[PDB]
Amino acid sequence: LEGLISARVDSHSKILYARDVDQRSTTFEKSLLMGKEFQRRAKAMMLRAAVLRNQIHVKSP
Amino acid sequence: SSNLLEQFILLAKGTSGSALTALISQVLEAPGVYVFGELLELANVQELAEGANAAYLQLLNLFAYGTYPDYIANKESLPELSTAQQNKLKHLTIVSLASRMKCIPYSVLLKDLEMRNLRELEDLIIEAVYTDIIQGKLDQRNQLLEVDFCIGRDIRKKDINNIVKTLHEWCDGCEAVLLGIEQQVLRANQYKENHNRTQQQVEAEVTN
Amino acid sequence: SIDEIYKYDKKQQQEILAAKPWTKDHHYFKYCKISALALLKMVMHARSGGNLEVMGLMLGKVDGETMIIMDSFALPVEGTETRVNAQAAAYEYMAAYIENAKQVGRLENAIGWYHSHPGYGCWLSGIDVSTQMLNQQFQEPFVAVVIDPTRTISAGKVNLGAFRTYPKGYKPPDEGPSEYQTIPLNKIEDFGVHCKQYYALEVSYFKSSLDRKLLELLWNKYWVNTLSSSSLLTNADYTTGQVFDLSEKLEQSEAQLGRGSFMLGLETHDRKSEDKLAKATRDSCKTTIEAIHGLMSQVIKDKLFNQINIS
Amino acid sequence: ATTADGSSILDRAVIEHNLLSASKLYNNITFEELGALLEIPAAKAEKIASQMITEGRMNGFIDQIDGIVHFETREALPTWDKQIQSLCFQVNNLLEKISQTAPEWTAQAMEAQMAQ
Amino acid sequence: SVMACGVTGSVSVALHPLVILNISDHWIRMRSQEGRPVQVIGALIGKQEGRNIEVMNSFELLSHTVEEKIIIDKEYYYTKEEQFKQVFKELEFLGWYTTGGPPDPSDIHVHKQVCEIIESPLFLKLNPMTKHTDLPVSVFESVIDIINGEATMLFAELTYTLATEEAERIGVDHVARMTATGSGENSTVAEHLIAQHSAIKMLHSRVKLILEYVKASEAGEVPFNHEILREAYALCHCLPVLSTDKFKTDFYDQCNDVGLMAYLGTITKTCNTMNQFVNKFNVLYDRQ
Amino acid sequence: ILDNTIHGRIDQVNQLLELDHQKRGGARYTALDKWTNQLNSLNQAVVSKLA
């Protein structure tokens, strides 16, 4: 938790093993999650700029 | 060889009787002759029967349609071979399984040819590469054998339909892909023409 | 003449090289005739190098005060500004062409060398003017032609122009830019000084050559090598290496948007390199187009041969 | 000269030559079978094959777990482009044979595509 | 006969108006030096990308004349082939042209030696009178046909067009004008698609040349030979090349690598247009 | 190994030096992680200019 290594404690044999994920699993999923937030934030920005065209500002408070 | 095939077909049609029986053993013993389709369909070898003459007719059929395990099962009824006739039969066994399946596993050739390791099993295959007989590649990960070029055993009188069928899909198959590539060029060129016109007429009206 | 310059004449080359009229006045060459078939070979060899500089060699003859550019071939040298004296690599090609031409009754020798200057337009820097003076005294005559491959795409203008550097003892003290083009704000101060070392020539065009006729007989047997595509595995290190340089450009764009080049009193002139976000977009798309270009050569191979199977 | 086995220098060049040819023909052979084919012990067939890989004169690797040395014969992507170039090379050699045996059939087959 | 239009080819010929200046340059020079209107022999050059034929310029032929035939100097042409093969390999060579008029039977014997070099040559004849609509030029193709049992090589006229390439027209107009050219469209996408479009047209012709060869040996045209059947049986048996589990696990892995990089590059192009719209909307419409 | 001279990993529980010849890539996947982090912070800057 504190270090930057990646080890696995095997209590069945008292041997510090190692079980890491694939390099393509942590890369394709991380890029796909960022691509979904990129399209969601870009489409949400058009909704904020849409009300700023027909002279509609902040009127909630 | 190719020049020796036109000499054995001329001597068999000129003589017959006891001279034809001695010509069969000379063809299988002399190397270079890998085809046996033009000599089996002839009427000279069909007249050999009753005794040792019938053994030469059955041996010619096993060298064209049979394989290696088909010869060891009836070795007592067929005449023995030498150091050159036995090695030539192993070359025809490799090209026999390639006509049915594209890839042949190593476990199949280890049982038919009766080996113990892979190099000794492939030792009889690499000898046909320099003689322009068997051409292909060796696979180690999948433990298979992808035979690309091989001999057609006989004159190919039954599997000749696959030759025209494979060439028809290569000629007619190119027309379907050509229609997709030509359509992609027209779509890409039309997108560049529409983008150049919509980017110049919208910038000229800013000054007015 | 008019009809004699279109063909190869042996009497024309025997009355010029034997007397050498260029030893009297260095301003003898006025026009330059470049073949239309050889122009496509010069714009294609420089376009394959991209942002790098390449050099080649041209072959032809002479006919008075006008040079003739017949055939031209490429050279494996990496330009001339990077490697000093780039004419040493062309010595093996010249020794095999002159010996094969004198036996058939041809006096065609060297005519000039062409290169490429992508970025700072088509001109001669301080390095090209020093090496050309040492080659004109040994392998005469020579002519320097610059081709800009990265300028005919955006502007759409075919940049072409031949120049000739004056030797020692004939440079004019004051001469304006004869062929002025576009120069970025970096090396524009050297254009007004180095322009007096050379001069532009009125380029012409004609149809002749000979190299553009024997390439069809070779394609009848060399067509098995033209299909050797699959660019995804050739320059695989250049595609991955370009992503490392993109991260440095993206980090500079974050500081550009944070500080801003529009301050009070002095705007649109604060930072040195402006529009970092617009320039980083084309760099990111370069790694995408080059990556999908190598895949198109592989998918087209799996649709013509892999879709055949067997019964 | 006395070069370990035998009484000549050729006793060492033959062993080194057979290992290079086996890297492109033999798939994977054990250490006990490779020594019996060369009349050499198993302790000598491993030291000679290991010196050829370090110097960069022989492909393949040696596995010390089961004692089975494997040879590299190219696979994966480099084998895909080799079969395509070898297939297109057969059409180039076949085109030269058709025009040589019957040059009239070459011009007739070309006009059939333009008519369709 | 000598002219009957046998098989009309469906190929498109992109003829250029610059091919007539080279023909007239060789006819006036040959007449002024000999004092008689003879027949000149040249060569048609250009570029062939499969179905489309582009004829840019032309050049005279460097051959001799003995008795009544034309011997192509193959000794000098093959000498420079070994040195010109390590630089480029583009720009094909078409056929040849001549100056005369009506088709003569003497030109049939000369066109027979041309087919031994290229598998698809072309014929051209310049006529002083009118014939077509624009320039008085016409392109012919070598079409063999039997006439009362005798097979003769006839010709077939075709209808040529203009420039069929945007990347090529910008280079041709800058050659004849010798001045300047207008800024248009360079078509960068079309310059890269010619490597794959011409590859299919080149492969479609090689299969057609070998399809009728094996089919003739099975029907009744080519005699039954055991050597031809044994040499073409395993030729098509290798198809498809590498289509097992080893190539299936590698083709899908390479597609996913470049597929993920395309998503990270597509979102960068959208951010470029988004920055130009935000800066133009937060100033005029917005004031904070 | 720490001096960037000998590649692989040491396994004391098996007395075998591991050297995976067909291991996972590390030259191309290391660039996609940096491109994702740079594009994530860039989207937060272009969206903050429009309230």
CSV table of C-alpha atoms in Angstrom, one decimal, chain C:
chain,number,residue,atom,x,y,z
C,1,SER,CA,18.8,24.9,-82.4
C,2,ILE,CA,15.0,24.4,-82.4
C,3,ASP,CA,14.8,20.9,-83.6
C,4,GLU,CA,18.3,19.8,-82.7
C,5,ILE,CA,18.0,20.4,-79.0
C,6,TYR,CA,15.1,17.9,-78.8
C,7,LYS,CA,17.4,15.1,-79.7
C,8,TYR,CA,20.9,13.9,-78.8
C,9,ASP,CA,23.5,15.5,-81.1
C,10,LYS,CA,27.1,14.4,-81.0
C,11,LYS,CA,28.5,17.4,-83.0
C,12,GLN,CA,26.9,19.8,-80.5
C,13,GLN,CA,28.7,18.4,-77.5
C,14,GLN,CA,32.0,18.2,-79.4
C,15,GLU,CA,32.2,21.9,-80.2
C,16,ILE,CA,31.4,23.1,-76.6
C,17,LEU,CA,33.3,20.7,-74.3
C,18,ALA,CA,36.5,21.0,-76.4
C,19,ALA,CA,36.5,24.8,-76.2
C,20,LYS,CA,34.9,25.4,-72.8
C,21,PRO,CA,33.1,28.7,-73.2
C,22,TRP,CA,32.4,29.0,-69.5
C,23,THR,CA,36.1,29.8,-68.7
C,24,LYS,CA,35.7,33.3,-70.2
C,25,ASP,CA,32.5,34.6,-68.5
C,26,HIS,CA,30.8,33.0,-65.5
C,27,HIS,CA,27.4,34.6,-66.6
C,28,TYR,CA,27.2,32.4,-69.7
C,29,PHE,CA,24.2,30.3,-68.6
C,30,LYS,CA,21.0,32.2,-69.0
C,31,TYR,CA,18.2,29.6,-69.4
C,32,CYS,CA,17.7,26.1,-68.1
C,33,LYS,CA,15.6,23.4,-69.8
C,34,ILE,CA,14.3,20.7,-67.4
C,35,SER,CA,12.6,17.7,-68.8
C,36,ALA,CA,9.0,17.0,-67.8
C,37,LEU,CA,9.7,13.3,-67.2
C,38,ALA,CA,12.6,14.1,-64.9
C,39,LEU,CA,10.6,16.6,-62.9
C,40,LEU,CA,8.4,13.9,-61.5
C,41,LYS,CA,11.4,11.9,-60.3
C,42,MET,CA,12.8,14.9,-58.4
C,43,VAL,CA,9.6,15.7,-56.5
C,44,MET,CA,9.0,12.1,-55.6
C,45,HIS,CA,12.5,11.4,-54.1
C,46,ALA,CA,12.4,14.4,-51.9
C,47,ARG,CA,8.8,13.7,-50.7
C,48,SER,CA,9.8,10.3,-49.3
C,49,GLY,CA,12.3,11.9,-47.0
C,50,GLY,CA,9.7,14.1,-45.2
C,51,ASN,CA,11.3,16.7,-43.1
C,52,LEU,CA,14.8,15.5,-43.9
C,53,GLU,CA,17.1,16.7,-46.6
C,54,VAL,CA,18.2,14.5,-49.5
C,55,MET,CA,20.4,14.9,-52.6
C,56,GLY,CA,20.7,13.4,-56.0
C,57,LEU,CA,22.4,13.8,-59.4
C,58,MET,CA,21.3,15.0,-62.8
C,59,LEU,CA,22.7,14.0,-66.3
C,60,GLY,CA,22.3,15.8,-69.5
C,61,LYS,CA,24.1,17.9,-72.2
C,62,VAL,CA,24.6,21.5,-73.3
C,63,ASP,CA,23.5,23.6,-76.3
C,64,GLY,CA,25.0,27.1,-76.0
C,65,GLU,CA,23.7,29.4,-73.2
C,66,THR,CA,21.0,26.9,-72.1
C,67,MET,CA,21.4,23.8,-70.1
C,68,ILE,CA,19.6,20.5,-70.8
C,69,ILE,CA,18.4,18.3,-67.9
C,70,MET,CA,17.9,14.8,-69.4
C,71,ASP,CA,18.0,11.9,-66.9
C,72,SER,CA,18.3,12.1,-63.2
C,73,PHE,CA,18.7,9.5,-60.4
C,74,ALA,CA,18.6,9.5,-56.6
C,75,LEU,CA,21.5,9.2,-54.2
C,76,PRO,CA,21.7,7.5,-50.8
C,77,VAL,CA,23.4,10.5,-49.2
C,78,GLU,CA,21.5,12.3,-46.5
C,79,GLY,CA,21.5,15.7,-48.2
C,80,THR,CA,24.4,18.1,-48.3
C,81,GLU,CA,24.0,20.4,-45.3
C,82,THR,CA,24.3,17.4,-42.8
C,83,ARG,CA,27.2,15.5,-44.6
C,84,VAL,CA,29.9,17.8,-45.9
C,85,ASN,CA,31.0,17.0,-49.5
C,86,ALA,CA,28.1,14.8,-50.7
C,87,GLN,CA,29.6,14.3,-54.1
C,88,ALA,CA,31.8,11.5,-52.9
C,89,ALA,CA,29.0,9.0,-53.0
C,90,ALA,CA,28.2,9.7,-56.6
C,91,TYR,CA,31.8,8.8,-57.8
C,92,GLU,CA,30.9,5.1,-58.2
C,93,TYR,CA,27.8,5.9,-60.3
C,94,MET,CA,29.7,8.3,-62.6
C,95,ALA,CA,32.6,5.9,-63.2
C,96,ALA,CA,30.1,3.3,-64.4
C,97,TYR,CA,28.2,5.7,-66.7
C,98,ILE,CA,31.0,7.5,-68.6
C,99,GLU,CA,32.8,4.2,-69.4
C,100,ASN,CA,29.6,2.7,-70.8
C,101,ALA,CA,28.8,5.8,-72.9
C,102,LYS,CA,32.1,6.3,-74.7
C,103,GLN,CA,32.0,2.8,-76.2
C,104,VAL,CA,28.7,3.4,-78.0
C,105,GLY,CA,29.6,6.9,-79.3
C,106,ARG,CA,28.0,9.2,-76.7
C,107,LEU,CA,29.6,12.2,-75.0
C,108,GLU,CA,26.9,12.8,-72.3
C,109,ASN,CA,28.4,13.6,-69.0
C,110,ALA,CA,27.4,15.3,-65.7
C,111,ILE,CA,25.2,18.4,-65.9
C,112,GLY,CA,24.3,19.3,-62.3
C,113,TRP,CA,23.1,18.1,-58.9
C,114,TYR,CA,19.7,18.6,-57.3
C,115,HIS,CA,18.7,18.6,-53.6
C,116,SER,CA,15.8,19.7,-51.3
C,117,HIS,CA,15.5,22.4,-48.7
C,118,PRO,CA,12.2,21.8,-46.8
C,119,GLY,CA,11.2,24.5,-44.4
C,120,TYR,CA,13.2,27.7,-45.3
C,121,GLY,CA,12.1,27.7,-48.9
C,122,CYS,CA,14.2,27.1,-52.0
C,123,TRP,CA,17.5,28.9,-51.6
C,124,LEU,CA,21.2,28.2,-51.1
C,125,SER,CA,22.6,28.6,-47.6
C,126,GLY,CA,26.2,29.2,-46.6
C,127,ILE,CA,27.1,25.5,-46.8
C,128,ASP,CA,25.8,24.8,-50.4
C,129,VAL,CA,27.6,27.8,-51.8
C,130,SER,CA,31.0,26.5,-50.5
C,131,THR,CA,30.8,23.0,-51.8
C,132,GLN,CA,29.5,24.0,-55.2
C,133,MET,CA,32.5,26.2,-55.8
C,134,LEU,CA,34.9,23.2,-55.4
C,135,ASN,CA,32.9,21.0,-57.8
C,136,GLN,CA,32.5,23.5,-60.7
C,137,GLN,CA,36.3,23.6,-61.1
C,138,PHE,CA,36.6,19.8,-61.5
C,139,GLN,CA,33.3,18.4,-62.9
C,140,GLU,CA,32.0,21.3,-65.1
C,141,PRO,CA,29.3,22.3,-65.8
C,142,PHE,CA,27.1,22.1,-62.7
C,143,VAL,CA,23.8,23.6,-61.6
C,144,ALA,CA,22.1,23.6,-58.2
C,145,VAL,CA,18.3,23.0,-58.3
C,146,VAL,CA,16.2,23.2,-55.1
C,147,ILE,CA,12.8,21.4,-54.8
C,148,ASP,CA,10.4,22.1,-52.0
C,149,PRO,CA,8.2,19.1,-51.4
C,150,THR,CA,6.4,20.4,-48.3
C,151,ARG,CA,5.4,23.6,-49.9
C,152,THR,CA,3.3,22.4,-52.9
C,153,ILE,CA,0.7,20.8,-50.5
C,154,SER,CA,-0.6,23.7,-48.5
C,155,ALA,CA,0.1,26.6,-51.0
C,156,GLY,CA,-0.4,24.3,-54.0
C,157,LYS,CA,2.4,26.1,-56.0
C,158,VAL,CA,5.0,23.9,-57.7
C,159,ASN,CA,8.2,25.4,-56.3
C,160,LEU,CA,11.0,25.1,-58.9
C,161,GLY,CA,14.1,27.2,-59.6
C,162,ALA,CA,17.7,26.7,-60.7
C,163,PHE,CA,20.6,28.7,-59.3
C,164,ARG,CA,24.4,29.0,-59.8
C,165,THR,CA,26.8,30.3,-57.2
C,166,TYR,CA,29.5,32.6,-58.5
C,167,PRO,CA,33.1,31.7,-57.8
C,168,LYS,CA,35.8,33.8,-56.2
C,169,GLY,CA,36.4,37.0,-58.1
C,170,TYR,CA,33.0,37.5,-59.8
C,171,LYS,CA,30.4,38.0,-57.0
C,172,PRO,CA,28.5,41.3,-57.3
C,173,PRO,CA,28.8,43.7,-54.4
C,174,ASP,CA,25.1,44.4,-54.3
C,175,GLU,CA,22.3,42.2,-55.8
C,176,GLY,CA,18.7,41.9,-54.7
C,177,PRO,CA,16.8,38.6,-54.4
C,178,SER,CA,16.1,37.3,-57.9
C,179,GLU,CA,13.8,34.5,-56.8
C,180,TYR,CA,12.2,35.5,-53.5
C,181,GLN,CA,9.8,33.0,-51.7
C,182,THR,CA,8.5,32.5,-48.1
C,183,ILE,CA,10.9,32.3,-45.2
C,184,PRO,CA,9.8,31.7,-41.5
C,185,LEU,CA,10.8,34.2,-38.9
C,186,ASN,CA,14.1,32.6,-38.0
C,187,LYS,CA,16.6,32.6,-41.0
C,188,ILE,CA,15.2,35.7,-42.8
C,189,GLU,CA,18.2,37.8,-42.0
C,190,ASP,CA,20.5,35.5,-44.0
C,191,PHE,CA,18.4,35.8,-47.2
C,192,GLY,CA,19.3,39.4,-47.8
C,193,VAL,CA,23.0,38.7,-47.6
C,194,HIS,CA,23.5,35.3,-49.3
C,195,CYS,CA,21.3,36.4,-52.3
C,196,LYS,CA,24.3,38.1,-54.0
C,197,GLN,CA,26.3,34.8,-54.1
C,198,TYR,CA,24.0,33.2,-56.7
C,199,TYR,CA,21.3,34.2,-59.3
C,200,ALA,CA,18.1,32.7,-60.6
C,201,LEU,CA,17.6,31.4,-64.1
C,202,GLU,CA,14.5,31.3,-66.3
C,203,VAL,CA,13.6,27.6,-66.2
C,204,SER,CA,12.1,26.0,-69.3
C,205,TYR,CA,10.4,22.6,-70.1
C,206,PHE,CA,10.8,20.1,-72.9
C,207,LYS,CA,10.1,16.4,-73.7
C,208,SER,CA,13.0,14.0,-74.3
C,209,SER,CA,15.0,12.1,-71.7
C,210,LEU,CA,15.7,8.4,-71.9
C,211,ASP,CA,15.6,7.0,-68.3
C,212,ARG,CA,11.7,7.0,-68.5
C,213,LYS,CA,11.7,4.3,-71.2
C,214,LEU,CA,13.7,1.3,-69.7
C,215,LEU,CA,11.7,1.1,-66.4
C,216,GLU,CA,8.8,-0.7,-68.1
C,217,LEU,CA,11.0,-3.6,-69.2
C,218,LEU,CA,12.2,-4.0,-65.6
C,219,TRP,CA,8.7,-3.9,-64.2
C,220,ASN,CA,7.8,-7.1,-66.2
C,221,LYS,CA,10.2,-9.0,-63.9
C,222,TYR,CA,10.5,-6.7,-60.8
C,223,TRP,CA,6.7,-6.5,-60.1
C,224,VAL,CA,7.1,-9.0,-57.3
C,225,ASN,CA,8.9,-6.3,-55.2
C,226,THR,CA,6.5,-3.5,-55.8
C,227,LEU,CA,3.8,-5.3,-53.7
C,228,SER,CA,6.1,-5.5,-50.7
C,229,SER,CA,4.0,-3.1,-48.6
C,230,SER,CA,3.1,-3.6,-44.9
C,231,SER,CA,4.4,-0.2,-43.6
C,232,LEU,CA,3.3,-1.1,-40.1
C,233,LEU,CA,6.4,-3.3,-39.6
C,234,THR,CA,8.9,-1.3,-41.6
C,235,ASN,CA,9.3,2.0,-39.7
C,236,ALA,CA,7.7,0.8,-36.5
C,237,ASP,CA,10.3,2.6,-34.4
C,238,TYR,CA,9.5,6.0,-36.0
C,239,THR,CA,5.8,5.6,-35.2
C,240,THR,CA,6.4,4.8,-31.5
C,241,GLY,CA,9.1,7.3,-31.3
C,242,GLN,CA,6.8,10.1,-32.5
C,243,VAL,CA,4.5,9.6,-29.5
C,244,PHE,CA,7.4,10.5,-27.1
C,245,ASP,CA,7.9,13.9,-28.9
C,246,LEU,CA,4.1,14.5,-28.8
C,247,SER,CA,4.1,14.4,-24.9
C,248,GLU,CA,6.6,17.2,-24.8
C,249,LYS,CA,4.5,19.3,-27.2
C,250,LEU,CA,1.4,18.7,-25.1
C,251,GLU,CA,3.1,19.7,-21.9
C,252,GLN,CA,4.0,23.1,-23.5
C,253,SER,CA,0.4,23.7,-24.5
C,254,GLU,CA,-0.7,23.4,-20.9
C,255,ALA,CA,1.5,26.4,-19.9
C,256,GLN,CA,0.3,28.3,-23.0
C,257,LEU,CA,-3.4,28.1,-22.0
C,258,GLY,CA,-2.6,28.9,-18.4
C,259,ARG,CA,-0.5,32.0,-18.8
C,260,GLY,CA,-2.2,33.2,-21.9
C,261,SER,CA,-0.7,35.3,-24.7
C,262,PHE,CA,-3.3,38.1,-24.2
C,263,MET,CA,-2.1,40.4,-21.4
C,264,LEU,CA,-2.8,44.0,-20.5
C,265,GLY,CA,-0.9,46.6,-22.6
C,266,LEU,CA,0.8,44.1,-24.9
C,267,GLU,CA,-1.3,41.2,-26.3
C,268,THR,CA,-0.9,38.6,-29.0
C,269,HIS,CA,2.9,39.1,-28.8
C,270,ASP,CA,3.9,37.7,-25.3
C,271,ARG,CA,5.0,34.1,-25.8
C,272,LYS,CA,7.6,33.1,-28.4
C,273,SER,CA,5.7,30.2,-30.0
C,274,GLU,CA,2.0,30.9,-30.1
C,275,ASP,CA,-0.9,28.7,-31.1
C,276,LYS,CA,0.6,25.6,-29.3
C,277,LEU,CA,-2.8,23.9,-29.2
C,278,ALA,CA,-3.4,24.3,-32.9
C,279,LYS,CA,0.1,22.9,-33.7
C,280,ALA,CA,-0.2,20.0,-31.4
C,281,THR,CA,-3.4,18.8,-33.2
C,282,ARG,CA,-1.6,18.2,-36.5
C,283,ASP,CA,1.2,16.4,-34.6
C,284,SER,CA,-1.3,14.1,-32.9
C,285,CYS,CA,-3.1,13.3,-36.2
C,286,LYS,CA,0.3,12.5,-37.8
C,287,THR,CA,0.7,9.5,-35.5
C,288,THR,CA,-2.8,8.4,-36.3
C,289,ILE,CA,-2.7,8.6,-40.1
C,290,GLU,CA,0.7,6.9,-40.2
C,291,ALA,CA,-0.6,4.1,-38.0
C,292,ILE,CA,-3.7,3.4,-40.0
C,293,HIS,CA,-1.8,3.7,-43.3
C,294,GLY,CA,0.2,0.5,-42.5
C,295,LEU,CA,-2.9,-1.4,-41.6
C,296,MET,CA,-4.6,-0.6,-45.0
C,297,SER,CA,-1.8,-2.5,-46.7
C,298,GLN,CA,-2.5,-5.6,-44.6
C,299,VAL,CA,-6.3,-5.6,-44.8
C,300,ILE,CA,-6.1,-5.4,-48.6
C,301,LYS,CA,-4.0,-8.5,-48.5
C,302,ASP,CA,-6.4,-10.5,-46.4
C,303,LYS,CA,-9.3,-9.7,-48.8
C,304,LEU,CA,-7.7,-10.9,-52.1
C,305,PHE,CA,-5.8,-14.0,-51.0
C,306,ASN,CA,-7.1,-15.0,-47.6
C,307,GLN,CA,-10.7,-15.0,-48.8
C,308,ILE,CA,-10.1,-17.8,-51.3
C,309,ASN,CA,-9.9,-20.9,-49.1
C,310,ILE,CA,-10.0,-24.4,-50.6
C,311,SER,CA,-12.7,-27.1,-51.1
